[PDB]
Amino acid sequence: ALGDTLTITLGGSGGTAKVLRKINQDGYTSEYYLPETSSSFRAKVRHTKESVKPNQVQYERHNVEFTETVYASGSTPEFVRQAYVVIRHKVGDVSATVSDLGEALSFYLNEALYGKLIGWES
Amino acid sequence: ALGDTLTITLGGSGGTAKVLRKINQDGYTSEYYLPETSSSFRAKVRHTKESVKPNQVQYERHNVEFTETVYASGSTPEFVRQAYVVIRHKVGDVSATVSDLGEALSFYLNEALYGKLIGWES
Amino acid sequence: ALGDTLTITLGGSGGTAKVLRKINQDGYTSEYYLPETSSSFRAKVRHTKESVKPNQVQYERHNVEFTETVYASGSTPEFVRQAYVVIRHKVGDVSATVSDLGEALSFYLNEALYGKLIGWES
Amino acid sequence: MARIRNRSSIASSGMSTFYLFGTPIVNEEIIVRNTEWCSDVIGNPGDNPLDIHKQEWTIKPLSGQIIFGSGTYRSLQCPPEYCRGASLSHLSLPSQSGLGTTALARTNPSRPAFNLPAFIGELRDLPRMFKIAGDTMLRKGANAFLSYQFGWKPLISDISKALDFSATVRTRSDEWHRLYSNGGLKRRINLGVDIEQKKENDVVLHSSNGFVVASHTVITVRKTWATVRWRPDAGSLPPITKSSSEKHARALLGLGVGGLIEGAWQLMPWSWMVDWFGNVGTFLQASNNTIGASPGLVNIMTTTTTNHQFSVKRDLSDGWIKGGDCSATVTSKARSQSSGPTITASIPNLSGRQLSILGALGIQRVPRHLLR
Ligand SMILES: [Ca+2]
Ligand SMILES: [Ca+2]
């Protein structure tokens, strides 16, 4: 499922709306595309499961990424702008705890943190 | 820096606030820790450079990592939870647009998306 | 955490109060020092966790040390006085009863018992 | 002397005209006036406070035209009149407190030193030991001190070790005296970075030839750091004797046992060795393997900058008006001085291999009374 068109709204709530479309899906993966004169939008959704090895917990991983590429103009060559998240947990673990952890991570990140994190403070 | 304590609110903005404490700092690398009766909370932040290639543009990297460990109970062994983000963009490019990217992603994710996403949908 | 200075009251409650200065920090380790005309005061804090084993118990050890050294006078060389304590327990143990055991050990030691102990009274 | 200086540059200029009856009734001019003014002190070798107030603009001129009966008005390549005021200020930020005290406390370089060996007390006595031993052996041959497994070769080895120690201490003293110069030892700390962003709305950009409204956004950044220089107190330095006699002594030692058997030994520089060994011994025992130091003044520098960027709102403008985007930047810098209570610190002089050279010199196994 997940819908047919993926919406990216740069600028958070109330921003500019961009719409992609399904292109391809293989290996439990999915891709979205949108072409433009000066740039293009990529979106990929991936799933995976680690190799079973006998007496330890077995884990499943999820990944979603947004990528933005700008075509070279004049001297400036190609360059990309990408940002993604990864989730890892157990297979039979209750989903509510993982969803709450994800909500917490989303809520902590905001434009204030992005503005601050750029300074390499640590 | 940003401080010595970080607040994690499980379940998004619902509640269940958690306050980690700074434990270390080594070269733009920071991590906070907090022990609990049946769980341990730990966060990590990192910044770095790629290997220099003779004729390719340099790239920024930001990593923010959340993890969690649940202590073995009964016959159930140890297992972990985590969720982390990564941002990539070139050196010296405009910071505000890169901020808008990433925070667009953060706005996109929400509880319903995780409910769907955990179901191996794509 | 640990402030910029470590206060020590040598002689137990009601003694002369000194204040060591934060001078070094790395890998969960920190140390305090203060120079004095005839002697010096040294205090460091260390933490460590042992590596993981296939079938064993994972333990953690804390350490705290005070060290006191007096400079040479005439033909008498220098000598140092120090005393440190450690605590060891599993990774997921209950913190409160560990604190109770620590209180027990601290309460047992008093000036009279130190006097008896130094006399090699076993 | 303290001087106030004002300086400016032209950022942009343009023209706007209104026609009526086919005549340019009003053709007023617009100027953007980049401005900065500074204060500084000269003529005094000591470090002085200074501050800077500085501002620039960046404007994309308007364009378009509109026509009426026998009259028009036009603002082609005309920077907006809003820049004529250009009054801007930094956003409020949390206040710092007691930066000087914290910098002075954290910056102190005092730390423990290597422990002084026992023979440093006897350090002053080495020369006569060697002189008397050599003289007695020469007078009564080499058979002396065979009961103690001693001879010519151990004596030369010990004296060579002593020269090595003397040169090492000499070089270290030279380094300390160099350090006393050029302002002493300097250290730096960082006192945090503060970042804040806000949003503003409904900024009128033009008030003639129509009206223009634009959005407004502001960015603020502050840094803060401090530096201090630690210099040795005058008179606490070690002896700084130069040394070319050791080269001569080493040259004599190269002659071997046969040379010293000849009149060569009477060429040893005993007086220099006695004087300098006594001086270094009394200095080491006076101090405890450390040099004192005192802090100079403490300075703090706090740069502050902000960006003011605009985007044209087209919903409250005449249709012919196009463009008008512009941005502005304001920067300030400061330098200020402070001082705290008196403090003294100690820094190690020599460590480990420096002091371990002569800790096991072999002549110590002979009883003192034979020499003394
Ligand atoms: Ca924004
Ligand atoms: Ca929830």
Side-chain angles (χ1 to χ4, degrees), chain D residues 288-303:
Chain D
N288 201 247
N289 191 341
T290 43
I291 297 303
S294 177
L297 283 71
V298 55
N299 56 68
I300 60 180
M301 293 180 183
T302 60
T303 183

mmCIF file of all heavy atoms in Angstrom, chain D residues 288-303:
data_model
loop_
_atom_site.group_PDB
_atom_site.id
_atom_site.type_symbol
_atom_site.label_atom_id
_atom_site.label_comp_id
_atom_site.label_asym_id
_atom_site.label_seq_id
_atom_site.Cartn_x
_atom_site.Cartn_y
_atom_site.Cartn_z
ATOM 1 N N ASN D 288 61.057 23.211 44.222
ATOM 2 C CA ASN D 288 60.777 21.776 44.165
ATOM 3 C C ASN D 288 60.501 21.459 42.698
ATOM 4 O O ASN D 288 59.346 21.391 42.270
ATOM 5 C CB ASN D 288 59.604 21.408 45.077
ATOM 6 C CG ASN D 288 59.595 19.939 45.459
ATOM 7 O OD1 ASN D 288 58.701 19.191 45.060
ATOM 8 N ND2 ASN D 288 60.584 19.519 46.240
ATOM 9 N N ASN D 289 61.579 21.263 41.935
ATOM 10 C CA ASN D 289 61.510 20.889 40.527
ATOM 11 C C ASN D 289 60.433 21.683 39.789
ATOM 12 O O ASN D 289 59.744 21.143 38.918
ATOM 13 C CB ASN D 289 61.265 19.381 40.402
ATOM 14 C CG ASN D 289 61.448 18.871 38.980
ATOM 15 O OD1 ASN D 289 61.409 19.640 38.020
ATOM 16 N ND2 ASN D 289 61.666 17.567 38.843
ATOM 17 N N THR D 290 60.264 22.963 40.130
ATOM 18 C CA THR D 290 59.212 23.771 39.528
ATOM 19 C C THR D 290 59.640 25.227 39.399
ATOM 20 O O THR D 290 60.471 25.721 40.165
ATOM 21 C CB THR D 290 57.917 23.700 40.349
ATOM 22 O OG1 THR D 290 58.219 23.810 41.744
ATOM 23 C CG2 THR D 290 57.177 22.393 40.087
ATOM 24 N N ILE D 291 59.051 25.909 38.416
ATOM 25 C CA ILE D 291 59.166 27.355 38.239
ATOM 26 C C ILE D 291 57.817 27.989 38.540
ATOM 27 O O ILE D 291 56.778 27.502 38.078
ATOM 28 C CB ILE D 291 59.622 27.729 36.818
ATOM 29 C CG1 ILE D 291 61.025 27.195 36.522
ATOM 30 C CG2 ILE D 291 59.564 29.241 36.627
ATOM 31 C CD1 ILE D 291 62.083 27.654 37.505
ATOM 32 N N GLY D 292 57.830 29.070 39.316
ATOM 33 C CA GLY D 292 56.612 29.805 39.576
ATOM 34 C C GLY D 292 56.144 30.598 38.370
ATOM 35 O O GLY D 292 56.878 30.819 37.404
ATOM 36 N N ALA D 293 54.883 31.028 38.424
ATOM 37 C CA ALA D 293 54.303 31.823 37.351
ATOM 38 C C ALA D 293 53.173 32.675 37.912
ATOM 39 O O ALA D 293 52.620 32.384 38.976
ATOM 40 C CB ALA D 293 53.790 30.938 36.210
ATOM 41 N N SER D 294 52.836 33.735 37.182
ATOM 42 C CA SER D 294 51.749 34.632 37.543
ATOM 43 C C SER D 294 50.948 34.970 36.295
ATOM 44 O O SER D 294 51.500 34.980 35.189
ATOM 45 C CB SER D 294 52.270 35.926 38.184
ATOM 46 O OG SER D 294 51.207 36.812 38.475
ATOM 47 N N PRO D 295 49.649 35.244 36.435
ATOM 48 C CA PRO D 295 48.828 35.531 35.255
ATOM 49 C C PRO D 295 48.787 37.006 34.895
ATOM 50 O O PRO D 295 48.679 37.885 35.752
ATOM 51 C CB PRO D 295 47.439 35.043 35.688
ATOM 52 C CG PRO D 295 47.409 35.306 37.145
ATOM 53 C CD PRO D 295 48.826 35.121 37.651
ATOM 54 N N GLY D 296 48.856 37.271 33.594
ATOM 55 C CA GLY D 296 48.620 38.599 33.075
ATOM 56 C C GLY D 296 47.132 38.887 33.018
ATOM 57 O O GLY D 296 46.304 38.177 33.592
ATOM 58 N N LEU D 297 46.790 39.955 32.305
ATOM 59 C CA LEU D 297 45.394 40.346 32.224
ATOM 60 C C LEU D 297 44.601 39.322 31.415
ATOM 61 O O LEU D 297 45.144 38.584 30.587
ATOM 62 C CB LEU D 297 45.267 41.738 31.606
ATOM 63 C CG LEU D 297 45.608 42.876 32.570
ATOM 64 C CD1 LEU D 297 47.113 42.911 32.840
ATOM 65 C CD2 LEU D 297 45.117 44.212 32.022
ATOM 66 N N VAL D 298 43.296 39.272 31.678
ATOM 67 C CA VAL D 298 42.385 38.356 30.996
ATOM 68 C C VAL D 298 41.499 39.162 30.057
ATOM 69 O O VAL D 298 40.904 40.170 30.461
ATOM 70 C CB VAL D 298 41.544 37.548 32.002
ATOM 71 C CG1 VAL D 298 40.793 38.474 32.958
ATOM 72 C CG2 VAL D 298 40.569 36.620 31.277
ATOM 73 N N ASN D 299 41.411 38.719 28.807
ATOM 74 C CA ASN D 299 40.650 39.403 27.777
ATOM 75 C C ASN D 299 39.545 38.493 27.262
ATOM 76 O O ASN D 299 39.683 37.265 27.249
ATOM 77 C CB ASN D 299 41.553 39.829 26.610
ATOM 78 C CG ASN D 299 42.315 38.663 26.005
ATOM 79 O OD1 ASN D 299 41.728 37.776 25.385
ATOM 80 N ND2 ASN D 299 43.634 38.660 26.186
ATOM 81 N N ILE D 300 38.445 39.105 26.840
ATOM 82 C CA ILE D 300 37.317 38.385 26.269
ATOM 83 C C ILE D 300 36.893 39.077 24.983
ATOM 84 O O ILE D 300 36.789 40.308 24.930
ATOM 85 C CB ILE D 300 36.142 38.292 27.263
ATOM 86 C CG1 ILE D 300 35.662 39.688 27.662
ATOM 87 C CG2 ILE D 300 36.555 37.487 28.485
ATOM 88 C CD1 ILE D 300 34.503 39.672 28.630
ATOM 89 N N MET D 301 36.651 38.278 23.947
ATOM 90 C CA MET D 301 36.235 38.761 22.637
ATOM 91 C C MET D 301 34.911 38.108 22.281
ATOM 92 O O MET D 301 34.782 36.883 22.356
ATOM 93 C CB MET D 301 37.282 38.433 21.569
ATOM 94 C CG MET D 301 38.595 39.179 21.729
ATOM 95 S SD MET D 301 39.783 38.736 20.445
ATOM 96 C CE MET D 301 41.220 39.680 20.949
ATOM 97 N N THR D 302 33.933 38.924 21.888
ATOM 98 C CA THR D 302 32.568 38.463 21.639
ATOM 99 C C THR D 302 32.083 39.057 20.318
ATOM 100 O O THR D 302 31.612 40.196 20.281
ATOM 101 C CB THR D 302 31.649 38.850 22.791
ATOM 102 O OG1 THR D 302 31.636 40.274 22.938
ATOM 103 C CG2 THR D 302 32.131 38.219 24.086
ATOM 104 N N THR D 303 32.207 38.285 19.239
ATOM 105 C CA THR D 303 31.682 38.699 17.944
ATOM 106 C C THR D 303 30.203 38.337 17.823
ATOM 107 O O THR D 303 29.768 37.274 18.272
ATOM 108 C CB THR D 303 32.472 38.043 16.808
ATOM 109 O OG1 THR D 303 31.986 38.517 15.545
ATOM 110 C CG2 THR D 303 32.346 36.522 16.849
#
